[PDB]
Design a protein around this ligand. Structure first.
Ligand SMILES: Cc1cc2nc3c(=O)[nH]c(=O)nc-3n(C[C@H](O)[C@H](O)[C@H](O)COP(=O)(O)OP(=O)(O)OC[C@H]3O[C@@H](n4cnc5c(N)ncnc54)[C@H](O)[C@@H]3O)c2cc1C
Ligand SMILES: Cc1cc2nc3c(=O)[nH]c(=O)nc-3n(C[C@H](O)[C@H](O)[C@H](O)COP(=O)(O)OP(=O)(O)OC[C@H]3O[C@@H](n4cnc5c(N)ncnc54)[C@H](O)[C@@H]3O)c2cc1C
Ligand code: SF4
Ligand code: SF4
Ligand code: SF4
Ligand code: SF4
Ligand code: SF4
Ligand code: SF4
Ligand code: SF4
Ligand code: SF4
Ligand code: FES
Ligand SMILES: [Fe+3]
Lengths: 291, 437, 252, 291, 252
């Protein structure tokens, strides 16, 4: 175990990408989140998983319980607006009849799952049926109207043409299907962030079985934390089964040094906000969920 | 070019500012008038709520014109579900609508008169002051608004946030006594509004013959074409409105599109011109950064791809080819709307059957079809659009008059001395809480 | 000596100000004799919040709007008596339902009544608030600050239930009638709540309140008006005398 | 003015009954509450009044705004279950267009009106348009199911046959149209009382312009308190116009001595209940609306 | 030494007891090793409330039922730890809607959660409450009273948010998510509230909660489950270890 104060508790950290070439075609990064859920399904570690499927408007995610490789793959790619993944967490154990639920999502959604496992409040059967969680790194998120405003105005792109979006190197990047690229400085995007993200003290999905993201690894590759016993069993067996290319993270640029720094900026900035809440008013303050 | 900023504006409804680029004489070259009122977000919070609740929430967008949102929202729901309301419900709604237009135009007299001159003098109206003629004028205005609110309360259940409108018509018809009372009050009101109208037109006509006004001690020249713009106008009725249930609707949703402030407002600027003597409290400090594209709180609806002017002048131009434009023309057209309000009320009372039905026998629950309703609010075309399915609002959109007028007024600021930009603004009778919703 | 009164407009609809103005010549009488309006963006050109004896504050506070937060803090600093005018200021009202996501400020998501950010001395609940109540509070505030001891005693007794409401909390709903009246063994079936509800969300079934919670816009009126919320017998039993006193103070 | 601590503030107290023989045919007692409202309407002191009209089930009252002599007379007779009279108080000034509202009801309903006059909370136009209030004496009230249980079980009568009910001389009396009489001991009725009546500290409608009831006067006659200037103007002019027979109350048996005693028992018992609320729990109590 | 546990049935539906029993062999394990059931009218013949280490109290209190009021007072007197078991006991739940008028006790009109009559140490909210939560609270209560100091420290940390809920108040509704989460700038759109709602009153529209208030039965579950109500990082980050500890305590 490593007990990093900004990267959470983990056993190891590698740089990885799926060896499944079909998965990689539309994966955001290394295809880790898709590849792990597909593999867990084929191996019987899960019988279904909650993923950010395609929704009713372009680039709007819709949470869905996926129970086939095909349905899991439909959720490839980052949607930078809210996907209420946990809304299907109980239902997966009811009408879907699952015994071994997988869950994908960002840090706060990983938090929601663990709170439900330990303090189930009208969440019967959920603590014992969560089987496998994969958490994405997340700096901040946006409402759908925010995402529309950023892509359509600031990047000047039609949503119906966008093939990929990416926040990296200080910019919001928009890639179109016909091959064009547009960028927006992140300074322009700040007004649009979901306000509840400003109180979030978790960057690399500390509470997931396995955590995965982009920062620290080259393009096409993911930085992966293997954290829990569940996480280590599944990762070991998938590596052994040929499912991933890996590199120790210390042999990779920018690697864990850049990552630990961005994690620190996130927590530091948000801890400050958390603190300003206490004296937000005159002789009174706002609620602190962490108190 | 220099940049001066007035924040906040005053003697209008709600919270806005003027971010103005001016030439070396202080004449606006390009000005942005923008909402900085927080977005309460009525369109998004409406989704999933019941079609009965949403109009009563929308009412609380604005307490000067709650009739506009109550009626436009209700009638958008009725248009989406295909509900035809009874005649006597419609007559009561028109009475409510006309009464509120009286109270609103008269309240606006209170807000604009401090910029105006007692005819033939260099004295401005101070309506607070217990002196003549101000006090006699205030007494007339006060009685006018009292009559108006009373009628509104009788026909609408409440003067502010009327309670009688409901999906399918009204909760209540009125008694024979109530109908007589409304008629008695409208007769009294008609004489008063004729007097107030002639008074206001004279004051305005005196303004058009002036060459300067005094702002903060200084003489400010009055341009002849003050407030002129080339956006044209939009209006759906001279009095009430229109909805997608009509055989021939008078608003065309294929000609409408709403953008963000992005397409029409200035980006980042820095204030380099400050006047601490601007009454009362000065202008924005030198060095302040402003960004109208990002700070504006409204969307920008357009008609044929361009901002438009809505409101009384828009109505008279659309329906009578009223052919004067700009600030004083807008003031004139607003005053001219006084008598139609009282004649309409009296005609509607005459046709109202106090034993008549006020609620449709059947209220359908909707299948998700789109409907829309336009109410000609005192400040202009208020258009609500909705999809109702199973009694719930699945989609909602509000194009409110001051929302329309924000980019148009902005363009009308060109040519004005920045010290009277606010006078250009007030001729639009702005409701910034309305505009933002 | 006239007291100094401001109208502060937070995230409100200005219907609270309209309600004040709907006292008609009563308002002009008050402005003539008892009070100077030192601040009101809707009616006067004073651009910044000055000192006030009484701040009539309408609307709630958007947490994501910096100027708004500064305004409500500045208001408490500048005012002897802070009045939450109307249900948005008292209880959030329709802004309880705000949840962001609309142009052009999709981050404008969170709204709180003013009592969650500053200390509030007096509630005037209602949506819309009744003109008569706003008038009574203005007149009594004056008497509390410029009267003889007999007047300042009356004024303090009159305002006490409205000050108690400010100390009780910042929430208003049809449920108040359940939580604090019916569930408390206090409801006696008078039907007043039904008359006060601005949206007709309350009916009485066999003499007992029935709330259409998905019609209720959370204004707090019904509990306020209920004669088993507060019933201060020392004031209300003197209704004839207190009415005559208020009338005389408005007389010409 | 008399300032009695149990009978409230009043100018005089007489024993009276209407001289209108039609009104008396179905009045509960002296016909005071009907006679005053009819007279106020004919004279223009009111243009309408809220009365306990006939409802949808036998002996269930329905509040209604009455604007004719005929509609007022429909409300004669005591209904011993809840009539939410104040529910029409604002509406009378809206769609009904009244300038001068009358209100009839029991003590707590008189209280509601005066609270609305002084603390109008979403009650615009109500303070200035209340013109005339007539309050009934009231010891306690009942739900409709309570009244059904009392009449049908304990008195063994069909509600469709009842012509009058009366609580007096320690009994609940039921009179049928065909001429029979049944009684129930009031001890049997106590379980059925509306619980909110047990906190009521007002017996003879202290806050009304005029108060009227039965106790203290013979059958067919009412005990009347004239309390406010409004009340004295209307009563004086009605007496002068020949509308009432009167007797000074001191010349009448049982008179004001019995009445003051029952008033005292009511307040004493209910003040005790009010007090027990404060320590109803362990280390906590129930709300006191009077605190 | 086994702790002494009672089940006290106020105005409840017994579904809270069923939820306890739905721990299956876990309940029998607890009764075998850690706890004696000294009182439960549904399962045992002890007629009167004895002394208890833990009283699991379900249902609310009818103010007009004398035996009920005496029972809840007697329970606090007889118990070291009082647990409001389920949403009726915590928050009133469907008995908020009670308003009298039904045979054969039309005066049975007023119901309050137990926390309005006695002091409550621990809330277990939910309707129905989750078996796992009731089990965790029983096990941790034992550890708090019979463990080493490392266990009593864990137990105290585990129970703290449930004790904080008991101190927060006695009201539960969909509005909690507005008042205390969205309106506070804390909602991040996870959707957990929607999963926990037992009546499907919550949907998410553009990532934000939408409450069908006339479906909501006022159980307080959604705010409880929300990860922005309480999120005690010291406990929840140790989910793997705390899970292993609880499992081992139930093992054969
Ligand atoms: C708001 C958001 C912010 C992020 N910020 C960062 C960051 O700052 N640094 C960094 O390194 N990585 C960040 N990521 C993660 C990164 O963008 C990729 O999502 C991650 O590397 C997974 O890529 P992959 O190839 O393994 O997954 P893929 O194989 O492409 O599969 C996509 C996975 O992402 C899930 N997913 C996609 N959109 C959402 C969504 N809105 N909400 C919940 N789950 C979703 C899907 O269920 C699926 O599990 C963010 C992701 C999101 C949604
Ligand atoms: C619950 C109740 C309890 C009472 N307890 C006593 C008592 O203890 N001692 C005593 O002397 N008198 C009591 N009275 C009053 C008495 O019964 C007569 O109502 C009173 O004397 C009026 O009689 P009247 O001939 O003047 O009125 P009538 O001419 O017969 O007119 C009846 C009047 O009573 C009103 N009314 C009838 N039923 C109700 C009702 N449920 N709620 C509100 N208003 C109603 C009507 O609006 C109308 O104004 C009680 C009345 C009620 C409703
Ligand atoms: S920054 Fe935190 S609260 Fe916001 S979406 Fe990402 S993990 Fe959730
Ligand atoms: S309380 Fe009602 S009338 Fe007053 S600002 Fe709020 S919505 Fe407007
Ligand atoms: S106003 Fe009357 S009916 Fe309504 S809750 Fe209060 S006492 Fe009960
Ligand atoms: S039920 Fe009506 S009066 Fe009571 S809080 Fe809701 S809207 Fe206001
Ligand atoms: S005893 Fe009091 S609370 Fe009960 S009905 Fe009579 S006057 Fe009202
Ligand atoms: S909380 Fe729900 S399950 Fe428990 S006693 Fe109450 S109704 Fe029953
Ligand atoms: S559970 Fe998630 S979506 Fe629901 S109120 Fe809490 S943070 Fe918002
Ligand atoms: S919305 Fe659902 S979970 Fe929340 S209090 Fe209501 S019924 Fe309970
Ligand atoms: S808290 Fe009232 S739904
Ligand atoms: Fe809009």
């Amino acid at each position: 175990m490593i007990e990093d104060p900004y990267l959470g508790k983990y056993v190891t950290c590698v740089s990885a990408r799926s060896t499944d070439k079909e998965i990689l075609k539309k994966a955001q990064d290394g295809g880790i989140a898709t590849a792990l859920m597909v593999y867990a399904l084929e191996e019987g570690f899960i019988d279904g998983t909650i993923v950010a499927g395609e929704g009713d408007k372009p680039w709007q995610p819709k949470p869905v319980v996926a129970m086939t490789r095909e349905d899991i793959l439909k959720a490839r790619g980052t949607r930078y607006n809210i996907s209420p993944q946990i809304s299907w967490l109980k239902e997966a154990t009811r009408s879907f009849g699952l015994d071994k639920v997988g869950v994908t999502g960002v840090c706060c959604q990983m938090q929601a799952v663990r709170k439900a496992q330990l303090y189930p409040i009208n969440m019967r059967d959920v603590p014992g049926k969560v089987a496998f969680t994969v958490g994405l790194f997340c700096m901040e998120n946006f409402s759908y109207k925010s995402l529309q405003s950023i892509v359509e105005d600031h990047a000047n792109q039609s949503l119906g043409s966008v093939k990929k979006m990416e926040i990296t190197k200080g910019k919001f990047w928009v890639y179109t299907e016909r091959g064009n690229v547009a960028t927006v400085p992140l300074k322009a995007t700040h007004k649009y962030e979901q306000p509840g993200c400003h109180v979030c003290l978790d960057y690399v999905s500390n509470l997931a079985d396995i955590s995965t993201g982009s920062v620290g690894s080259p393009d096409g590759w993911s930085t992966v934390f293997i954290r829990t016993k569940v996480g280590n069993e599944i990762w070991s067996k998938a590596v052994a089964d040929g499912m991933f290319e890996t590199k120790p993270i210390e042999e990779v640029k920018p690697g864990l040094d850049l990552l630990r720094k961005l994690a620190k900026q996130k927590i530091d900035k948000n801890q400050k906000t958390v603190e300003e809440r206490k004296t937000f008013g005159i002789n009174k303050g706002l609620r602190n969920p962490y108190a | 070019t220099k940049v001066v900023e007035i924040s906040p504006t005053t003697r209008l409804e709600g919270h806005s500012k003027l971010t103005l680029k001016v030439n070396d004489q202080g004449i606006v070259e390009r000005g942005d008038w923008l909402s900085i009122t927080p977005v309460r977000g009525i369109e998004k919070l409406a989704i999933g709520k019941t079609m009965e609740q949403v109009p009563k929430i929308a009412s609380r967008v604005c307490g000067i014109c709650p009739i506009a949102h109550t009626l436009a929202s209700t009638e958008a729901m009725e248009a989406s579900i295909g509900c035809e309301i009874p005649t006597d419900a419609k007559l009561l709604r028109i009475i409510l609508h006309a009464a509120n237009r009286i109270h609103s135009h008269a309240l606006h007299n209170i807000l604009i008169l401090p910029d105006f001159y007692i005819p033939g003098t260099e004295k401005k109206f101070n309506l607070f002051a217990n002196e003549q003629p101000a006090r006699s004028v205030m007494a007339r205005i006060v009685r006018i608004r009292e009559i108006a609110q009373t009628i509104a309360a009788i026909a609408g259940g409440e003067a502010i946030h009327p309670s009688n409108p409901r999906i399918g018509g009204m909760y209540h018809n009125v008694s024979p006594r109530a109908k007589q009372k409304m008629a008695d009050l409208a007769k009294e009101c008609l004489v008063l509004v004729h007097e107030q109208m002639e008074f206001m037109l004279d004051v305005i006509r005196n303004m058009q013959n002036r060459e300067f006004v005094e702002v903060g001690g200084k003489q400010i020249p009055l341009p002849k074409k003050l407030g002129y713009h080339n956006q044209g106008v939009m209006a759906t009725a001279p009095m009430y409105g229109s909805s997608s249930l009509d055989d021939n609707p008078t608003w065309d949703f294929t000609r409408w599109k709403e953008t963000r402030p992005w397409d029409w407002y200035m980006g980042e600027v820095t204030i380099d011109l400050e006047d601490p003597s601007y009454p009362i409290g000065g202008t924005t400090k030198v060095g302040t950064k402003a960004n109208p594209q990002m700070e504006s709180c409204t969307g920008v609806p357009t008609y044929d791809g361009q901002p438009v002017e809505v409101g009384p002048r828009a109505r008279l131009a659309t329906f009578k080819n009223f052919d004067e434009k700009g600030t004083f023309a807008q003031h004139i057209a607003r005053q001219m709307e006084y008598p139609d309000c009282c004649y309409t009320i009296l005609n509607c009372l005459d046709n109202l059957n106090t034993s008549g039905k006020v609620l449709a026998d059947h209220i359908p629950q909707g299948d998700g079809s789109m409907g829309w309703a336009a109410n000609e609010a005192p400040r202009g075309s208020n258009i609500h659009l909705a999809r109702v399915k199973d009694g719930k609002v699945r989609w909602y959109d509000m194009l409110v008059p001051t929302t329309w007028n924000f980019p148009t007024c902005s363009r009308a600021l060109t040519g004005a001395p920045w010290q009277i930009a606010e006078m250009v603004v007030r001729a639009y009778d702005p409701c910034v809480s309305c505009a933002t919703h | 000596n006239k007291i100094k009164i401001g109208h502060v407009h937070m995230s409100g609809c200005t219907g609270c100000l309209v309600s004040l103005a709907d006292n008609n010549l009563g308002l002009i009488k008050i402005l003539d004799d008892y009070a100077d309006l030192v601040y009101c963006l809707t009616l006067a050109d004073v651009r910044h919040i000055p000192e006030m004896d009484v701040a009539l504050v309408e609307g709630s506070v958007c947490l994501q709007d910096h100027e708004s937060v500064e305004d409500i803090k500045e208001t408490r600093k500048k005012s002897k008596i802070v009045v939450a005018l109307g249900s948005c200021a008292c209880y959030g009202n329709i802004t309880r339902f705000s949840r962001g996501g609309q142009h052009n400020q999709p981050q404008h998501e969170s709204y709180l009544p003013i009592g969650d950010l500053i200390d509030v001395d007096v509630y005037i609940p209602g949506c819309p608030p009744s003109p008569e109540l706003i008038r009574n509070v203005a007149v009594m505030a004056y008497l509390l600050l410029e009267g003889n001891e007999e007047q300042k005693e009356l004024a303090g007794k009159y305002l006490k239930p409205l000050m108690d409401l400010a100390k009780r909390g910042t929430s208003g709903c049809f449920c108040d009638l359940m939580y604090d009246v019916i569930n408390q063994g206090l409801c006696m079936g008078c039907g007043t709540c039904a008359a006060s509800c601005p949206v007709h969300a309350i009916t009485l079934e066999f003499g007992k309140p029935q709330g259409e919670r998905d019609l209720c816009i959370k204004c707090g009126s019904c509990y306020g008006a209920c004669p088993r919320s507060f019933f201060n017998l020392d004031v209300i039993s003197e209704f004839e005398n207190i009415s005559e006193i208020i009338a005389k103070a408005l007389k010409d």
